[PDB]
Design a protein around this ligand. Structure first.
Ligand SMILES: NC(=O)c1ccc[n+]([C@@H]2O[C@H](COP(=O)([O-])OP(=O)(O)OC[C@H]3O[C@@H](n4cnc5c(N)ncnc54)[C@H](OP(=O)(O)O)[C@@H]3O)[C@@H](O)[C@H]2O)c1
Ligand SMILES: Nc1nc2c(ncn2[C@@H]2O[C@H](COP(=O)(O)OP(=O)(O)O)[C@@H](O)[C@H]2O)c(=O)[nH]1
Ligand SMILES: [Cl-]
Length: 345
């Protein structure tokens, strides 16, 4: 049985990827940060009754800023595949801690690549890097594809850009099987609560149950290609099963605005948003049956916004056989219903 190592296994994608690989019969190791409290909620069902289910699943303490810990882990488990999903993954937060973001999301990638070399595993271990459509930033073409030049617009995107290219360089310098999944935005009921989609659906669920009065957002006009994270982790695995390492965009090929996300989320609870005030300004607000339910707060703006992302996944469809399954309609409805069920649980 193959051995997979997942960094960031406690995050949204890592939790779905772990399920995917366990079902394929992998032995799955995950690196978890030490936390002062419980922080494994997304994977707790995978180890809950580990003593009876005998699942090939094991969690280990580590951190992407501690090079020696990474090498110690990799030298002992000698994985067939590493998926580097660990990151300070939030764009807005990256403006507040750009250095930590660079150290985790940039140099952390290199630490793992160097760990492979230091263990002499170049012929054994494949490496997936969690790259991102954020690299396109101020997009230089529409749609964006594997050949679209990058224009990062946050310290997160800059750090992820270092990682994209250090992966390419180790692939080309050392003939390592290392590649970049250029994934566009993907969400789920497991999305972190301060990303815009999950923030919308948690707020709408609370508004339905009368536990919240108003939702405060930033830029309503940002447009994103939005898929379901569960669809996207399989693309990660599929890149590693290719004969030759190559970088792939993964996307739905359609985009929607934050505003439309808001509208669709409220429609799932039978409510209609009417926008009032100068459209696109901080005076704009969303009305439901006369009551202000959405407001704009400049604190959620980013200093350099990424206005619109639209992926062309043609290469992934034809080379990997991958295509999104969850539609945008289904994505929104699944998250709103999930978040209502969570409140009533
Ligand atoms: N979601 C998207 O739309 C999207 C699109 C393209 C690329 N990406 C990238 O894909 C990856 C997975 O995304 P995601 O949404 O699942 O992110 P996420 O939910 O925020 O998960 C990030 C993971 O990294 C861990 N981590 C953070 N800093 C760490 C450190 N110093 N050492 C070790 N582990 C650390 C986190 O641990 P804790 O639980 O302790 O915080 C968490 O398990 C990230 O690299 C992200 O930047 C995401
Ligand atoms: N996180 C967040 N994003 C918002 C909000 N209002 C608008 N946005 C926009 O939604 C887009 C998606 O942001 P986000 O969900 O954090 O994922 P990102 O693509 O990695 O930045 C960005 O253009 C944000 O500026 C908000 O209240 N929170
Ligand atoms: Cl464990």
């Amino acid at each position: 049985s193959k051995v997979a190592l997942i960094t960031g296994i406690t995050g949204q994608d890592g939790s779905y990827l772990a399920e995917f690989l366990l079902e394929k019969g992998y032995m799955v190791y995950g690196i978890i940060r030490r936390s002062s409290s419980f922080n494994t909620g997304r994977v707790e069902h995978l180890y809950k009754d580990i003593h009876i289910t005998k699942a090939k699943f094991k969690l280990l303490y580590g951190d992407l800023t501690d090079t020696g810990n990474l090498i110690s882990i990799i030298a002992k488990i000698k994985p067939d595949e590493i998926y580097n999903l660990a990151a300070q993954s939030h764009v807005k937060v990256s403006f507040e801690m750009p250095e930590y973001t660079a150290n985790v999301d940039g140099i952390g990638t290199l630490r793992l690549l160097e760990a492979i070399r230091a263990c002499g595993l170049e012929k054994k271990t494949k490496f997936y890097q969690a790259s991102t459509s954020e690299l396109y930033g101020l997009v230089q073409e529409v749609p964006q594809k594997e050949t679209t030049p990058f224009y990062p617009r946050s310290p997160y995107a800059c750090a992820k850009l270092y990682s994209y290219w250090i992966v390419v360089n180790y692939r080309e310098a050392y003939n390592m099987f290392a590649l970049n999944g250029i994934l566009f935005n993907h969400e789920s009921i497991r999305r972190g609560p301060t990303f815009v989609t999950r923030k919308i659906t948690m707020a709408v669920a609370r508004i339905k149950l009368g536990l919240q009065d108003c939702l405060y957002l930033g830029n309503l006009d940002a447009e994103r290609d939005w898929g379901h994270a569960k669809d996207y982790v399989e693309a990660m695995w599929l890149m590693l099963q290719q004969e030759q390492p190559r970088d792939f965009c993964v996307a739905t090929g359609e985009k929607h605005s934050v505003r439309e996300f808001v509208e669709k989320a409220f429609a799932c609870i039978g409510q209609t948003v009417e926008w009032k005030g100068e459209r696109g300004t901080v005076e704009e607000h969303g009305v439901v049956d006369g009551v202000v339910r959405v407001r704009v707060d400049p604190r959620y703006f980013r200093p350099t916004e990424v206005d619109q992302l639209l992926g062309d996944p043609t290469l992934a469809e034809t080379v990997l056989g991958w295509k999104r399954k969850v539609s945008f309609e289904e994505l929104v409805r699944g998250m709103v219903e999930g978040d209502i069920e969570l409140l009533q649980s």
